[PDB]
């Protein structure tokens, strides 16, 4: 009720023993009443790491997209090793979304090992289940072997109608994924544990399909982008390997449907000046000159007749003596070129000022035998050359032509494919202009450049014309146990790419959301432009390039930081060597670096001196020391995880306030969220994502579904909370419902359409579907839809929500009116009360927890102790939790090695992982998520609670309670204990606790029993007894 405290555990297990006397009664009662329940004490397990690999083939659907909807691929298993290292090799294959599916290694939902189907942004099939939302779904198939080796499984996807299908060993499965959102781009994904070998079959060139695709679905190998080569890569990675060693990489520039759709400028609405007709035909005449030039350069020749294919020139005169068809043919496109110029901002009019007279018009090949042709080039480029502004104008003009052509091709219906299937309207060059290779770009802009030369020869007067994006930034900082408050240190940062790369020293309590340098807790230097950053931008040094190493020495004796670039001290504008001065001792400083989107660096802290380049150039004789040099193990580092997470409300927040009031009369106990600085300067207003901390879990199965009757209240199953919207708050900005632990959407232009709901349909294999089941990661409704007011609304809406632990029927109630919408979820959903709001008034939200007609309070739902009490209550554990954009997370000291390579046109690409890696995971029961156990090295409160939990475990089985010790062995396994013994990154208190727990639950009674007998020396008469002598014979 009050929360997780160590002092409560001390109070509990003061009953463990007294003066060295065990109390079996209290020991068994505490064991039986805490250890089977398991909602309070955190639990720890051993798992093995997983890795997800994708092909770089991103295909999606939107309004007018240039992509095809249907695609098909296969995976064939070479070999699996089941139950490797005491855990089954998890292996799922399916489809995943670039925008939303981030499979960060280590931790996550459930007990970690998050694969394809452990989220609503990806759907997979491991052989027997269609995994989605961390939930397995058994399905009947002809062969149920869970991807045994030498088995080939196909998977196809349709975007025009949302559909995902699998064909295990050629035989299709009886399940189909459908009704999923179509946002972003979908790619194949294979999630695997170690000790596995698979092959990615893409058909056609890269590999060959074992089974031909069903009609409609196309091979994925043809969807490869023109400038991209088919490469297997980790999906969302923050670390790679290079020449020097581990290379830290930042985020990546990802595509979507927005850049796959073209949006051109309409040029048919442009008025025609006289200059239109001024140049419309002189451009056409030079165009005819290029026509003669092209037929000369080709195998064609001179002729009077109207057939270029037979070595004939239709015009047969220098000036085109062209009929109505071809005259209009050149007329309209010359005009349209002028229309695009005017629309996009190029000026119009060609005042040559004797430049036409200067124009030679004498570059004639003279191959013509008669009056045909005789069109000479006028040396437009030689007389007047292009300028870079005009060349970029050429690029965007050809882009506009590409986009209008793509627009009409899409309107009639065309698809992108690397093979140009004309009868299928397939073409590899219909995607927007920002994606075609350099050949198409040059071939579509070179004639435009020649047209620009013609304009220059004509003397043309043409003149050339809240989301902080935490996803694009990543902060990497050494662990807070390595802080230095004295000494002189030095750590290198090597640059692989040139981007927004920041490097320096930061206070250990730096905020992950705000970027480096903006806060006073970061003395950082951005080497993209050389500028340093303590409380703002400051010009300094010089911008760097690829291959440059920055030295970043700090000395706390002189309270300064000095940066070196390639062994030479960077110099400030004023000429000062030190970038920052007058630094207080503070709490210490830590090596930190920020990487922009698509940046690669090498943060060499200085573990090995020979690897540490340029240290002798600057630092060996200067008295500075390599940061973390003598430490044998590599330094653990923490990266800013971009996955948003709910955290408890901070009372230190200067913008939001929560007031908790209990004992209210004619009112349930309430928590009011208000804006501390509404309508003031520098006030942040964004989407506020609330969530009450405690979960609500359904019963195991759905066996049976106003001064109320006490027995009916005791028999009820439903619960009801009410959120109250204040005057001045827009009901259209309020969303009330139910969040699963898997909710990680932080977008501030929130729409109910953006939520992820997906349905799974399992039926007869021959085509009679019977079972369908829908799920969603969220269950809000749109408050504007509910109010239907259609303008300040002073009325207070109590938009309350119902939930019954049986039959999953969730109905709503707005301003005392039953709701026409309902939701249905399977048992054991573990939902959370939630409300989303856009602050528009001083008073914003009031959570209200109480009872209603035939209604059991939500407090009685979330707390088992008061399940019979109808009185509403607000114990300190329940609280408002707000979403936070980013949070720190540990990077494991070792990552899974994967070897991926292609073998042949038939075999294709193969993925192999052999070395197994095991991680200990600490699972928080309420949030249904696990962190790495080593992550507690900076989470000191959870460290305190887990150390005291180990103390509880030791002393419930202390003093020879072998029954309870056996009961403990389920919680704490033998292999678990062995790994906690062997590892070195375990914190101090946890290490001592686990060692003493092993001794207590396995060796304490036996050791005591032997110790009580070592006092005596009862010795019998044996031939071994006559063997002992005082001095052994040397």
């Amino acid at each position: 009720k009050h929360g997780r405290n160590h002092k409560v555990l001390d109070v509990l297990c003061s009953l463990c023993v007294c003066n060295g006397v065990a109390v079996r009664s209290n020991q068994d009662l505490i064991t039986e009443n805490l250890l089977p329940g398991r909602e309070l004490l955190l639990q720890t397990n051993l798992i093995n790491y997983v890795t997800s690999i994708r092909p770089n083939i991103f295909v999606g659907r939107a309004e007018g997209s240039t992509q095809y909807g249907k695609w098909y691929f296969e995976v064939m298993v070479d070999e699996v090793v089941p139950f490797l290292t005491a855990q089954a090799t998890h292996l799922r294959v399916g489809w995943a979304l670039t925008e939303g599916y981030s499979p960060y290694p280590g931790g996550g939902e459930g007990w970690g090992g998050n694969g394809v189907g452990d989220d609503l942004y990806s759907y997979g099939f491991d052989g027997l289940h269609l995994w989605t939302g961390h939930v397995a779904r058994p399905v009947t198939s002809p062969g149920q072997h869970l991807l045994a080796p030498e088995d080939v499984v196909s998977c196809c996807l349709d975007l025009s109608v949302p559909s995902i299908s699998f064909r295990i060993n050629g035989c299709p499965v009886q399940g189909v994924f459908e009704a999923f959102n179509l946002d972003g781009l979908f790619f194949p994904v294979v999630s695997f544990s170690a000790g596995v070998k698979v092959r990615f079959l893409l058909g056609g060139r890269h590999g060959e399909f074992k089974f031909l695709p069903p009609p409609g679905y196309a091979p994925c190998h043809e969807a490869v982008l023109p400038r991209e080569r088919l490469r297997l890569e980790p999906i969302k990675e923050y670390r790679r390997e290079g020449p020097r060693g581990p290379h830290l990489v930042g985020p990546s520039r990802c595509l979507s449907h927005t850049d796959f759709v073209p949006c051109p400028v309409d040029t048919v609405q442009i008025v025609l000046p006289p200059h239109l007709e001024r140049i419309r035909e002189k451009l056409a005449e030079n165009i005819h000159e290029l026509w003669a030039l092209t037929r000369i350069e080709q195998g064609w020749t001179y002729g009077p007749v109207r057939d270029d294919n037979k070595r004939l020139h239709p015009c047969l005169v220098n000036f085109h003596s062209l009929p109505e068809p071809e005259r209009n043919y050149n007329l309209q496109m010359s005009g349209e070129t002028l229309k695009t110029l005017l629309a996009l901002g190029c000026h119009v009019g060609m005042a040559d000022e004797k430049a036409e007279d200067n124009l030679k018009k004498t570059k004639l090949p003279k191959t013509y035998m008669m009056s045909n042709g005789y069109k000479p080039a006028p040396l437009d480029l030689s007389h007047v050359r292009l300028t870079p502004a005009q060349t970029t104008l050429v690029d965007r003009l050809a882009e506009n032509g590409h986009n209008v052509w793509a627009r009409d091709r899409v309107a009639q219906g065309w698809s992108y494919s690397a093979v140009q299937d004309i009868p299928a309207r397939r073409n590899p060059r219909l995607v927007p202009y920002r994606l075609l290779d350099e050949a198409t770009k040059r071939s579509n802009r070179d004639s435009l450049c020649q047209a620009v030369r013609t304009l220059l020869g004509y003397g043309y007067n043409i003149e050339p014309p809240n989301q902080s994006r935490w996803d694009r930034v990543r902060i990497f900082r050494a662990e807070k146990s390595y802080t230095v408050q004295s000494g002189r240190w030095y750590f290198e940062f090597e640059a692989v790419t040139t981007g927004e790369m920041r490097v320096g020293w930061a206070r250990p309590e730096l905020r992950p959301d705000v970027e480096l340098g903006a806060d006073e807790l970061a003395y950082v230097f951005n080497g993209h432009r050389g500028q340093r950053w303590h409380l703002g931008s400051e010009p300094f040094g010089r911008p760097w390039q690829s291959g440059d190493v920055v030295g970043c020495m700090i000395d706390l004796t002189e309270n300064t930081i000095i940066f070196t670039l390639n062994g030479e001290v960077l110099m400030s504008d004023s000429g000062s060597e030190t970038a920052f001065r007058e630094i207080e001792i503070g709490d210490g400083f830590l090596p930190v670096c920020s990487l922009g989107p698509g940046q690669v660096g090498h943060l060499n802290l200085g573990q090995d001196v020979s690897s540490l380049r340029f240290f002798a150039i600057c630092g060996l004789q200067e008295g500075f020391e390599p940061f973390a040099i003598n430490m044998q193990r590599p330094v653990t580092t923490w990266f800013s995880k971009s996955l948003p997470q709910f955290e408890p409300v901070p009372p230190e927040h200067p913008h939001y306030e929560v007031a908790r009031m209990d004992g209210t009369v004619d009112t349930p106990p309430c928590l009011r969220l208000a804006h501390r600085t509404w309508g003031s300067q520098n006030s942040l207003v964004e989407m506020l994502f609330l969530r009450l901390s405690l979960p609500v879990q359904f019963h195991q199965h759905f066996r049976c579904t106003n001064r109320d009757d006490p027995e009916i209240i005791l028999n009820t199953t439903t619960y009801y909370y009410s959120v109250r919207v204040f005057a001045g708050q827009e009901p259209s900005c309020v969303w009330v419902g139910w969040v699963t632990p898997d909710y990680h959407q932080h977008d501030m232009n929130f729409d109910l359409s953006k939520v992820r709901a997906v349905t799974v349909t399992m039926g007869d294999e021959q085509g009679n579907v019977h079972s369908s089941l829908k799920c969603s990661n969220c269950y809000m409704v749109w408050g504007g839809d509910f109010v239907s007011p259609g303008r300040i609304s002073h009325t207070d809406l109590v938009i309350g929500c119902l939930v019954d632990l049986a039959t999953g029927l969730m109905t709503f109630t707005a301003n005392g009116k039953e709701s026409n919408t309902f939701f249905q979820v399977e048992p054991n959903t573990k939902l959370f009360p939630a409300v989303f709001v856009l602050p528009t008034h001083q008073n914003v939200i009031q959570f209200e927890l109480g009872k209603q007609k035939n209604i059991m309070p939500l407090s009685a739902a979330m707390f088992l102790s008061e399940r019979k009490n109808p009185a509403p209550q607000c114990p300190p554990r329940l609280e408002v939790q707000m979403l936070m954009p980013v949070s720190w997370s540990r990077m494991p000291n070792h990552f899974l090695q994967v070897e991926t390579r292609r073998a042949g046109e038939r075999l294709g690409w193969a993925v192999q992982c052999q070395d197994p890696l095991t991680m200990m995971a600490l699972h928080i029961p309420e949030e249904n998520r696990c962190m790495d156990i080593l992550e507690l090295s900076e989470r000191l409160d959870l460290q305190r609670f887990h150390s005291h939990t180990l103390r509880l475990y030791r002393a419930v089985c202390a003093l020879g309670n072998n029954r309870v010790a056996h009961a403990l062995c389920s919680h704490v396994d033998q292999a678990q204990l062995l790994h906690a013994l062997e590892d070195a990154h375990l914190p101090g208190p946890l290490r001592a606790g686990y060692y003493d727990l092993l001794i207590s639950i396995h060796l304490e009674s036996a050791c005591r029993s032997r110790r009580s007998m070592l006092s005596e020396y009862i010795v019998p008469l044996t031939p071994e007894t006559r063997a002992i002598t005082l001095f052994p014979p040397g």
Partner: nanobody
Framework: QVQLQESGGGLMQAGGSLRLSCTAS????????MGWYRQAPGKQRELVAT???????NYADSVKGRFTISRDNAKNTVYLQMNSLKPEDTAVYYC?????????????????????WGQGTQVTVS
């Protein structure tokens, strides 16, 4: 877009006089050249006759066949008077519209890219 109807011909015996009237309407653009294409059995799209504004027949492939293509720009409806029905004429026909007359392209590849193919109908020779 330009979404023209391809029709004309059908089942016929050898040497069958067929008027393949491919109808085009609802199109302001790509009214210059109105080409005819043909998929022979196991063959690519072979152009047969590309009429042009002013009723100008194009001769690039299969000039020998008496295609006799004609069109008026008033209604943009083309009609192909094909009598010669060779065995390889047992095949399918297509009707494309574009504003680049065949045998005349001094701009580049996008101008050729502007074209609007047809539905596709069988003309069978027996």
């Amino acid at each position: 877009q330009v979404q023209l109807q391809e029709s004309g011909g059908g089942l016929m015996q050898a040497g069958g006089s067929l008027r393949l009237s491919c109808t085009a309407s609802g199109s302001i653009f790509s009214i210059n050249s109105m080409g005819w294409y043909r998929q022979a059995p196991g063959k690519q799209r072979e152009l047969v006759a590309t009429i042009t504004s002013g009723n100008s027949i194009n001769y690039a492939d299969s000039v020998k066949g008496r295609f006799t293509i004609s069109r008026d720009n008033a209604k943009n409806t083309v009609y192909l008077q094909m009598n010669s029905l060779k065995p390889e004429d047992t095949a399918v026909y297509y009707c494309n519209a574009d504003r680049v007359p065949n045998g005349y392209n001094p701009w580049g590849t996008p101008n050729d890219e502007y074209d609007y193919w047809g539905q596709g109908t069988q003309v069978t020779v027996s």
